[PDB]
Each structure stands twice: as structure tokens, then as C-alpha cells.
Amino acid sequence: ETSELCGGARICYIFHETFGRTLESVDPLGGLNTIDILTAIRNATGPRPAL
Amino acid sequence: PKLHDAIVEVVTCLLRKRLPVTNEMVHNLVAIELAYINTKHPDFAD
């Protein structure tokens, strides 16, 4: 019966138009505050000195 | 004479008492150098 997308290709939709796009919206530079990162890498060094 | 030698014995006893103490210190001194490397040392640059 011709109707709303369901059953089969609706899941295809879920795995592309929904899911694929959803992931495309994520970050890739999200959370990357330069200054906070500079702090983070200072923390990564820790108690020692670094070259 | 008996006193004389007794004196000597006591002296070396004292020396032996303080021996291992210094040994421990020297051991520690090396360990301290092993404990940490200062790459910010004033004479160390590259």
C-alpha cells in the first residue's frame, strides 16, 4: 500500500537521512577552545619540564 | 699499654658506626640525581 515510508527503506532513511546526517552535525571542532587546550597540554606535561 | 690499645679500638668503633651512615647518604645522593631530570637547568640548553 502506497503510504508513509515504513518497514524497509524507512530504516534505510534512519541509517542515512537521520543517522548519517546526525553524525555530520557533530563537532568536528566542537569543544576545541584553543586556550583550554593549551591548559590541557600543560596538564599533559604534568610535574616535569618538556622539550 | 692496655689503655692505649683500648683507645684505638674505641676510635675505630666510632668510625665504623659513622661509616654506613655516610654510605646511606651517598647512595641517597645518587638516587636524588636519578629521581628527577631538570631540563630547565640553567646550564642545560640546546
- What determination technique applies here? cryo-EM
Backbone angles phi, psi at A31, to 5 degrees: 90, -10
- Cell numbers 647518604 label which residue? B25
Interface mutation target, options A45, A48, A51, chain B, most CBs of B under 10 Å: A48
Largest CA distance in chain B: 66
Q: Name the resolution in angstroms.
A: 4.2
Q: Tell me A47's DSSP state.
A: T
Q: B interface toward A at CB cutoff 8 Å?
A: 36-40
Q: A29 is written with which cell numbers?
A: 571542532
- Cβ atoms B39, A49 nearer than 8 A: yes
Taking the Cβ of residue A50 and every Cβ of chain B, the question of whether any pair is shorter than 8 Å is answered with yes
Residue A13, burial from CB neighbour count under 10 angstroms (0-12, 13-18, 19+)? middle
- For residues A7 and B25, what is the distance between their CA atoms, to the nearest angstrom? 80
Q: Which three cell numbers stand for residue A33?
A: 577552545
Kindly list the residues from chain B whose CB atom is less than 8 angstroms away from the CB atom of residue A46.
Answer: none
